[PDB]
Amino acid sequence: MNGTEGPNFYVPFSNKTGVVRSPFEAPQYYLAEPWQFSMLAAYMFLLIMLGFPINFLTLYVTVQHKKLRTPLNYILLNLAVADLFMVFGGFTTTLYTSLHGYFVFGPTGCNLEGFFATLGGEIALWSLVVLAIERYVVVCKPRFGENHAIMGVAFTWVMALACAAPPLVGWSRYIPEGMQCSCGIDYYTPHEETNNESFVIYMFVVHFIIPLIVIFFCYGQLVFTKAEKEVTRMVIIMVIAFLICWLPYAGVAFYIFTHQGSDFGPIFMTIPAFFAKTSAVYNPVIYIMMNKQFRNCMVTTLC
Amino acid sequence: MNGTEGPNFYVPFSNKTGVVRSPFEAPQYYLAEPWQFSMLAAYMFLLIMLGFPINFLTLYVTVQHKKLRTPLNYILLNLAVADLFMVFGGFTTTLYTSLHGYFVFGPTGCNLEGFFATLGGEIALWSLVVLAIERYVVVCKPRFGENHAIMGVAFTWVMALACAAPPLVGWSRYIPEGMQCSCGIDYYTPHEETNNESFVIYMFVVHFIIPLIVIFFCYGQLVFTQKAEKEVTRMVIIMVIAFLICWLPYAGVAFYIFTHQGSDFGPIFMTIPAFFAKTSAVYNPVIYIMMNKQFRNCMVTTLC
Ligand SMILES: *[C@@H]1O[C@H](CO)[C@@H](O[C@@H]2O[C@H](CO)[C@@H](O)[C@H](O)[C@H]2NC(C)=O)[C@H](O)[C@H]1NC(C)=O
Ligand SMILES: *[C@@H]1O[C@H](CO)[C@@H](O[C@@H]2O[C@H](CO)[C@@H](O)[C@H](O)[C@H]2NC(C)=O)[C@H](O)[C@H]1NC(C)=O
Ligand SMILES: CCCCCCCC/C=C/CCCCCCCC(=O)OC[C@H](O)CO
Ligand SMILES: CCCCCCCC/C=C/CCCCCCCC(=O)OC[C@H](O)CO
Ligand SMILES: CCCCCCCC/C=C/CCCCCCCC(=O)OC[C@H](O)CO
Ligand SMILES: *C/C=C(C)/C=C/C=C(C)/C=C/C1=C(C)CCCC1(C)C
Ligand SMILES: *C/C=C(C)/C=C/C=C(C)/C=C/C1=C(C)CCCC1(C)C
Ligand SMILES: *C(=O)CCCCCCCCCCCCCCC
Ligand SMILES: *[C@@H]1O[C@H](CO)[C@@H](O)[C@H](O)[C@H]1NC(C)=O
Ligand SMILES: *[C@@H]1O[C@H](CO)[C@@H](O)[C@H](O)[C@H]1NC(C)=O
Ligand SMILES: CCCCCCCCCCCC(=O)O
């Protein structure tokens, strides 16, 4: 093993010289210079200060205007609430942690940071499943109304909780990653007490591979068979934007899971882990650019 | 003296324990925690990421619409330009300085950080002098056209340079302040080789007190003596109020230090006014959007 395993952490840095200290106890300056932890905090402050208003505005505009009740409108309203949970539930801990260079809040802070980002990202993924089914129904007509949209919204939360909640209560766990200033699923240690390996296989299959299979089946039908054109185009971009956001993190996590103990440093997971946190801001941006109706309503309300 | 004087710095920290090091050589962690320096860097990062777009958009809209050629439009276009100089010329040094906790660029970065913020602040202050005179001529009718607006624009740069430039070339000097991650004028040392004392008086009289006298003279003439003009007059009042909120605490603390050199103050004493004043690069286009119906709709047209 080329890293240091503690009771509830795995530092990607050898302790042969004795300088490794727990990410729940002391700043992690032995593995990165202070100016690197500061860049993480500046990045996290930007996401909070952009993520809070753009998601709140999306929530407010949709609630005020009764014309915005299509399945897309409900799903984007759902993402806005989910994004707001990421910003205030998780990103506030990310910022405070990155300011001090360790999880001052201890494992409670790690649970907060990991759970809300895992929950929010899984809400996004299962929402794309809902939109792919809705597009496949509307376009290929083998109707999808408000009741089916609200049922999909509730469905995303149940599926997201089925992924995010178990690591809080003893099936796997949230553990610091990279420079130890963000948290994720434990791909690093076997840790039979929480049965880590069975959860990782459960997460990639049920919560990463099955949703993609559904999405690309519906897209397979759409391809291989003008208001609706606009919605379909935006969902195409939502799928692409999701894949850019999460594939680097998913790929590196799976590499670590299959190469536990191998030689990797703190930067290896840090960059994908913090890049994935743009997940809380990007979906409303696509909304404004690619929905004429919502953009007009937002300019109406804001002006 | 309760601080430490070096050849080109004044650290508001006692070296009676030997820990003080030059802010051009080593991180200043001995006077503040690293998380404190991280907050300055995150603060400056937000200012850069908001400052560039909202000022570039203000520039782009004004140029793209020939209808925006009133004196107010010219003065706000001039401010957007000066703000961009602040963001790219000075704020980039501030962010890099804050990330490492000291002026890695040495005194040259300090010159960049202080000069562009002093220039942008003085362009704004003299812009309000030009706006107050314009409102006085327009409303009191004692005609202010495009020629006078453009002449006012050049006048603001001349007066701002007369304030920002001398510290670059031997009259006073730019010097780190607070936690040593931004720079201002030397109110800390006599340093008579640069004739510091004479400059501080000149800066506060010609470039502080005189502009305020003109502004409040023109305002008083307005008070103790149609709808389109009322909108502009209202925004000019808020611009002046915003300037005082942004810059009065810094000037007051700076003048207290000038009159109490070597007195018992710490790094936090100037840090907060110094970095709060760096909002000067952002707020003016925000008032413009909120308080000019014509410009706001021109921007929505451009943006959509
Ligand atoms: C990294 O190695 C050092 C050195 O072995 C560990 O520090 C020692 O921990 C033991 C047990 O608490 C103490 O008895 C020693 O006094 C410590 N030595 C020093 C020099 O502090 C350290 O705990 C290790 N880090 C991790 C995360 O395991
Ligand atoms: C603050 O005091 C310390 C301690 O006297 C100074 O450090 C000494 O500086 C001299 C001259 O630069 C060196 O010859 C010594 O080797 C230094 N001693 C130590 C222990 O480092 C330091 O220069 C002072 N700081 C300032 C800004 O004047
Ligand atoms: C694990 C628990 C899962 C949930 C269990 C719920 C209770 C059982 C459901 C019965 C279906 C009864 C109604 C079936 C209606 C099907 C047709 C339909 O929904 O049509 C809508 C219509 O098109 C207008 O939008
Ligand atoms: C902690 C985990 C929680 C997980 C569970 C989350 C469930 C979210 C669903 C809420 C539906 C609320 C009711 C919304 C009703 C809207 C009605 C509407 O707008 O349309 C009415 C129309 O008549 C229709 O046909
Ligand atoms: C459709 C749009 C897609 C857009 C997104 C494209 C993403 C491309 C990269 C994926 C990450 C793959 C991770 C693979 C990790 C292997 C790392 C490795 O082998 O590194 C060994 C080394 O020892 C370690 O330090
Ligand atoms: C900084 C916060 C981080 C890195 C949160 C991590 C969250 C996960 C472990 C999420 C897992 C996945 C998704 C939400 C979508 C893509 C597929 C998964 C299972 C890798
Ligand atoms: C962080 C950057 C700083 C602190 C820049 C400092 C700028 C000045 C020294 C500005 C001076 C003044 C104005 C521009 C307006 C108010 C009067 C002065 C002289 C205090
Ligand atoms: C309503 O009357 C008009 C409202 C116009 C709002 C446009 C303001 C946009 C300012 C730029 C924001 C940049 C933030 C993102 C930086 C990465
Ligand atoms: C540690 O790194 C070395 C060098 O890459 C590698 O040979 C070894 O397999 C790694 N350890 C584990 C447990 O993978
Ligand atoms: C230093 O601080 C003490 C305590 O207030 C004060 O008496 C002394 O005059 C100060 N020195 C200078 C040079 O102001
Ligand atoms: C402008 C887009 C930049 C794209 C950044 C991709 C982030 C993931 C990089 C993965 C590198 C690593 O394994 O550490």
Side-chain angles (χ1 to χ4, degrees), chain A residues 2-65 68-142 144-223 225 227-303, chain B residues 2-65 68-142 144-223 228-304:
Chain A
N2 296 279
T4 304
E5 183 186 357
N8 52 0
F9 60 87
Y10 183 91
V11 173
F13 193 93
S14 171
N15 198 29
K16 50 188 181 300
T17 58
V19 303
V20 171
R21 286 206 279 173
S22 175
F24 300 129
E25 297 181 0
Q28 300 290 286
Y29 299 152
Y30 64 89
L31 49 73
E33 305 191 30
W35 66 263
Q36 302 173 240
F37 290 94
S38 181
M39 284 179 56
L40 292 178
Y43 170 86
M44 287 315 302
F45 187 61
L46 186 64
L47 294 187
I48 300 165
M49 293 301 293
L50 303 189
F52 166 52
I54 195 176
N55 284 290
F56 178 78
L57 186 56
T58 300
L59 176 146
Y60 187 102
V61 172
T62 301
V63 169
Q64 180 176 7
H65 295 267
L68 305 180
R69 296 298 181 271
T70 64
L72 180 79
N73 299 139
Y74 280 110
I75 292 296
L76 268 295
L77 172 64
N78 194 44
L79 294 171
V81 176
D83 292 340
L84 286 172
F85 274 110
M86 300 180 65
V87 173
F88 289 115
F91 286 4
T92 52
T93 291
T94 322
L95 171 59
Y96 190 81
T97 294
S98 299
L99 290 163
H100 297 281
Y102 73 104
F103 274 95
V104 189
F105 299 156
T108 296
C110 181
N111 282 330
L112 291 176
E113 212 284 319
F115 166 76
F116 277 115
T118 309
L119 174 81
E122 282 295 331
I123 289 160
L125 176 58
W126 286 109
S127 304
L128 298 175
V129 170
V130 171
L131 289 181
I133 287 173
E134 182 264 349
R135 291 290 88 189
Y136 163 76
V137 161
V138 166
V139 174
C140 287
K141 291 170 184 66
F144 203 116
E146 294 196 38
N147 298 344
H148 303 116
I150 302 167
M151 195 195 320
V153 164
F155 177 79
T156 64
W157 281 87
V158 176
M159 297 308 295
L161 283 161
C163 182
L168 292 173
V169 291
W171 192 18
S172 194
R173 55 184 184 177
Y174 290 114
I175 188 179
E177 298 195 86
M179 289 174 52
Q180 309 297 285
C181 288
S182 72
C183 280
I185 288 312
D186 188 358
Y187 338 102
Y188 305 95
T189 75
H191 205 252
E192 284 83 356
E193 186 172 22
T194 52
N195 305 262
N196 273 9
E197 174 176 15
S198 63
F199 183 91
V200 179
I201 303 293
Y202 160 73
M203 183 185 59
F204 276 108
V205 172
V206 176
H207 294 293
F208 172 59
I209 283 185
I210 276 183
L212 289 188
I213 289 175
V214 180
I215 296 168
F216 282 98
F217 171 82
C218 300
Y219 131 99
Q221 295 291 85
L222 290 207
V223 164
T225 48
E228 298 290 22
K229 194 181 67 174
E230 196 199 34
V231 178
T232 301
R233 289 174 162 179
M234 173 172 156
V235 178
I236 288 186
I237 295 302
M238 295 182 67
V239 176
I240 302 170
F242 183 91
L243 287 181
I244 292 178
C245 180
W246 287 103
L247 274 183
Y249 181 76
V252 171
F254 189 62
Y255 176 80
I256 288 183
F257 179 62
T258 57
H259 298 73
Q260 290 179 351
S262 60
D263 194 5
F264 52 89
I267 302 302
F268 180 53
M269 184 49 106
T270 297
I271 307 305
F274 273 73
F275 185 61
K277 298 186 193 304
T278 66
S279 62
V281 68
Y282 77 77
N283 273 310
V285 187
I286 300 175
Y287 202 9
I288 290 165
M289 291 185 44
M290 300 190 72
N291 202 265
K292 182 183 176 179
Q293 195 176 39
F294 174 78
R295 175 168 68 257
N296 297 345
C297 273
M298 179 200 45
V299 177
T300 282
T301 292
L302 220 59
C303 317
Chain B
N2 289 278
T4 304
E5 176 162 10
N8 45 0
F9 57 90
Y10 184 82
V11 171
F13 200 88
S14 169
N15 204 30
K16 69 185 165 180
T17 66
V19 303
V20 172
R21 294 206 281 178
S22 162
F24 302 117
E25 296 177 9
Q28 305 292 286
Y29 297 141
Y30 64 89
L31 47 77
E33 313 263 47
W35 69 262
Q36 299 176 248
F37 292 99
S38 296
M39 292 192 59
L40 298 188
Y43 175 80
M44 293 309 300
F45 188 57
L46 184 71
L47 289 178
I48 297 179
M49 298 298 301
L50 291 189
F52 161 60
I54 198 174
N55 282 290
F56 178 84
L57 184 55
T58 297
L59 184 153
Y60 184 94
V61 171
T62 304
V63 173
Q64 205 77 344
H65 298 254
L68 299 167
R69 296 297 177 273
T70 73
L72 181 65
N73 305 143
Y74 280 105
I75 293 295
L76 260 291
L77 171 63
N78 182 37
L79 289 183
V81 175
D83 293 349
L84 285 173
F85 278 110
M86 287 180 66
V87 168
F88 290 102
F91 284 7
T92 51
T93 296
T94 326
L95 172 66
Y96 196 80
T97 309
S98 298
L99 284 166
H100 299 268
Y102 80 106
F103 272 95
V104 187
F105 303 151
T108 296
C110 180
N111 283 335
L112 292 165
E113 211 287 328
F115 166 78
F116 279 107
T118 303
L119 180 75
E122 286 295 327
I123 292 188
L125 174 55
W126 287 102
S127 283
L128 305 171
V129 172
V130 168
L131 286 176
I133 293 163
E134 186 271 346
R135 289 289 93 192
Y136 173 54
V137 179
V138 163
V139 176
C140 289
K141 299 172 184 175
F144 202 111
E146 272 182 286
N147 288 334
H148 317 86
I150 298 170
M151 185 150 45
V153 164
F155 167 79
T156 60
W157 281 89
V158 175
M159 296 304 300
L161 282 165
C163 179
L168 294 172
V169 292
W171 197 18
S172 191
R173 57 183 177 171
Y174 292 107
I175 197 165
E177 318 189 76
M179 297 167 55
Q180 305 299 291
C181 288
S182 62
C183 282
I185 295 302
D186 192 354
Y187 335 101
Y188 305 92
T189 69
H191 201 259
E192 249 127 312
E193 187 180 40
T194 43
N195 291 118
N196 286 6
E197 174 186 284
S198 62
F199 182 91
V200 182
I201 302 180
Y202 152 79
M203 180 190 52
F204 269 110
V205 167
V206 171
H207 302 285
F208 181 56
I209 288 179
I210 288 178
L212 288 188
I213 290 176
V214 177
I215 291 169
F216 284 117
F217 175 86
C218 289
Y219 144 83
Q221 295 296 112
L222 294 180
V223 165
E229 302 288 12
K230 192 188 57 179
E231 188 189 34
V232 177
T233 298
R234 287 172 169 175
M235 174 182 162
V236 175
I237 300 170
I238 295 298
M239 293 187 61
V240 177
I241 295 178
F243 182 86
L244 299 168
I245 294 177
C246 179
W247 283 102
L248 279 192
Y250 177 80
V253 169
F255 185 83
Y256 170 86
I257 295 168
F258 178 61
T259 58
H260 299 77
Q261 298 186 342
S263 60
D264 193 6
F265 58 85
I268 305 307
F269 184 50
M270 186 52 109
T271 292
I272 306 182
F275 275 78
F276 181 65
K278 295 185 197 305
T279 61
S280 54
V282 171
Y283 73 80
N284 276 310
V286 183
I287 302 170
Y288 200 16
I289 298 172
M290 291 175 47
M291 302 192 72
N292 198 274
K293 175 188 182 178
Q294 182 181 53
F295 176 76
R296 168 163 72 255
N297 307 336
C298 289
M299 199 179 53
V300 167
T301 294
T302 287
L303 239 40
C304 312

